[PDB]
Paper text:
The centrosome, which plays a central role as the main microtubule (MT)-organizing center for animal cell division, is a membraneless organelle composed of a pair of orthogonally arranged MT-derived apparatus, called centrioles, and the surrounding pericentriolar material (PCM). Here, we demonstrate that two of the human PCM scaffolds, Cep63 and Cep15212–14, cooperate to generate a higher-order cylindrical self-assembly capable of recruiting their downstream components, such as Plk4, a key regulator of centriole duplication. Here we showed that two centrosomal scaffolds, Cep63 and Cep152, cooperatively interact with each other to generate a heterotetrameric α-helical bundle, which in turn self-assembles into a higher-order cylindrical architecture that resembles the localization morphology of endogenous Cep152 detected around a centriole. Remarkably, short (~50 residues) coiled-coil heterotetramerization regions of Cep63 and Cep152 and their neighboring hydrophobic motifs (i.e., Cep63 P1 and Cep152 M4d) were necessary and sufficient to generate the cylindrical self-assembly capable of recruiting its guest molecules critical for centriole duplication in vivo.
As expected, a smaller Cep63 P1b5(502–541)•Cep152 M4e15(1205–1257) complex lacking the hydrophobic motifs maintained its 2:2 heterotetrameric state (expected MW 25.56 kDa) without forming any detectable high MW complex. In particular, identical hydrophobic residues in the parallelly aligned Cep152 helices appeared to constitute the backbone of the bundle by engaging in pairwise ladder-like interactions (top). Cep63 helices did not directly interact with each other, but rather interacted with both Cep152 helices in an antiparallel fashion (middle and bottom). Since Cep63 P1 and Cep152 M4d form an elongated four-helix bundle that may serve as a building block for the self-assembly, the mode of interaction between the bundles may likely determine the directionality of the assembly that positions Cep152 at the outskirts of the Cep63 arrangement.
Author numbering:
A (entry chain C): 499 to 541, 1205 to 1249
B (entry chain A): 499 to 541, 1202 to 1248
The structure:
């Protein structure tokens, strides 16, 4: 029954990582409506907008790297626990 | 016996998704230079600024869609390991 706990954990880990991507998408969507409103109420905005997407994408790249790195450690931990189970 | 091959595979998948990630970041930067270039000309400037904004949001939705597929596959992998752990009780 080791692996069922592994899958339960993946299911949680999956729910969290997707939550923190929605957070990032929405922040982009909010900041960018504001900035498009500034420019429309006027007659520099290209840098705020592009600035924002770079922000959202950077944060997505960080969070995906932390997930990936956690995943590798988890796998290595299981490699370890398998070898411990070989004890006579 | 089994779990080192799981790790290896995890390493491989992890590098393939990060190639994918930088791949369509860089692609989606090409797509924006075209429409940014239009908006710079017009000083319809705003309808064109919304379109750009709609491309950034859409681009970051495609990144999410690839990231969901990756996650989904991890769940499928772990599921396959529940199965094979069950088969080894045989």
């Amino acid at each position: 029954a080791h692996m069922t706990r592994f899958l339960e954990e993946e299911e949680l880990r999956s729910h969290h990582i997707l939550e923190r991507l929605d957070a990032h998408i929405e922040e982009l969507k909010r900041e960018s409506e504001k900035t498009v409103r500034q420019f429309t109420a006027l007659k520099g905005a290209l840098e705020e907008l592009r600035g924002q997407y770079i922000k959202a994408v950077k944060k997505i790249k960080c969070d995906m790297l932390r997930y990936i790195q956690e995943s590798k450690e988890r796998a290595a931990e299981m490699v370890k626990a398998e070898v411990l189970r070989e004890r006579q």
